[PDB]
UniProtKB/Swiss-Prot annotation, chains A, B:
Post-translational modification: Phosphorylated by protein kinase C.
Name of the protein described by the UniProt record: Myc box-dependent-interacting protein 1
Assembly: Heterodimer with AMPH. Binds SH3GLB1. Interacts (via SH3 domain) with DNM1. Interacts with SYNJ1. Interacts (via SH3 domain) with DNM2. Interacts with CLTC. Interacts with AP2A2. Interacts with AP2B1. Interacts with MYC (via N-terminal transactivation domain); the interaction requires the integrity of the conserved MYC box regions 1 and 2. Interacts with BIN2. Interacts with SNX4. Interacts (via BAR domain) with BACE1. Binds (via BAR domain) F-actin.
Organism: Rattus norvegicus
Included stretch of the parent chain: 506 to 588 of 588
Taxonomic superkingdom: Eukaryota
Location of the protein in the cell: Nucleus; Cytoplasm; Endosome; Cell membrane, Sarcolemma, T-tubule
Bilayer-spanning residue ranges: none
Residue ranges annotated for the SH3 domain, each copy included: 10-83
Tissue/organ expression: Highly expressed in the brain and muscle. Isoform AMPH2-1 is expressed only in the brain where it is concentrated in axon initial segments and nodes of Ranvier. Isoform AMPH2-2 is widely expressed.
Biological role stated in the UniProt entry: Is a key player in the control of plasma membrane curvature, and membrane shaping and remodeling. Required in muscle cells for the formation of T-tubules, tubular invaginations of the plasma membrane that function in depolarization-contraction coupling. Required in muscle cells for the formation of T-tubules, tubular invaginations of the plasma membrane that function in depolarization-contraction coupling. Is a negative regulator of endocytosis. Is also involved in the regulation of intracellular vesicles sorting, modulation of BACE1 trafficking and the control of amyloid-beta production.
Lineage per the UniProt record: Eukaryota, Metazoa, Chordata, Craniata, Vertebrata
Length: 83, 83
């Protein structure tokens, strides 16, 4: 895998998981400590819960998987801002 | 199952899970939305991570399971204080 130049629409910033997170639902992102995540906006605010972000793993993004199928929510305090 | 009167040593307060949490490690507590948790102190502070609590599910406690084997850490913002 390479490094794609363009970033997802609405890209805000990059986070790295500091702790594993196991998805409990289909709309959640599964993480491993070390994963880089590209944070993007919620596409519906009524699904937005305090303490949660919406993202797409950098890995998925670089392999050009479709964004609607790969993005998911995760707890902000399992990560820290990077880059 | 009944309602035991005594509370675990160091008991601080009671929380209820607002979202499921799947343990990713043996020292973490597995929760379901609705579970009541009895919050207790960390027995070693070098294992204490910001944003995390130590607890024992009320269910386990009421069935007199051993405390050292049933307690675990969980993310504070998956819960809210009750009672």
């Amino acid at each position: 895998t390479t490094g794609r130049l363009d970033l997802p629409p609405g890209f805000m910033f990059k986070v790295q998981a500091q702790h594993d997170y196991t998805a409990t639902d289909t709309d959640e992102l599964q993480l491993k400590a070390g994963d880089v995540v590209l944070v993007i906006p919620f596409q519906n605010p009524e699904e937005q819960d305090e303490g949660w972000l919406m993202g797409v793993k950098e890995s998925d993004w670089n392999q050009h998987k479709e964004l609607e199928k790969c993005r998911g929510v995760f707890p902000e305090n399992f990560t820290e801002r990077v880059q």
